[PDB]
Amino acid sequence: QLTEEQIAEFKEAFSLFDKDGDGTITTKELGTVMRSLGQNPTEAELQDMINEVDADGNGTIDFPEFLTMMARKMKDTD
């Protein structure tokens, strides 16, 4: 169940990528965090990953659609 606290927990993960705090994670933010994760995805890889979550087709992920992806995987306890 999406509790109030969980919404805040998701925010912590969002701000981890959104460095400047614009509210939208671009390929630059993603690439920076990905490198610290021990990986090195190319431009094409980064953009493709964005398109996976972006159901609008704007080339950027915001908090609302970010929640949708998280909830979609959290609603599965199997």
Binding site: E9, E12, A13, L16, F17, L37, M70, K73, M74
Partner: peptide, 12 residues
């Protein structure tokens, strides 16, 4: 900080 690591995996 563990939770953040888990949430990061869900982002992959």
């Amino acid at each position: 900080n563990d939770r953040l690591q888990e949430l990061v995996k869900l982002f992959k």
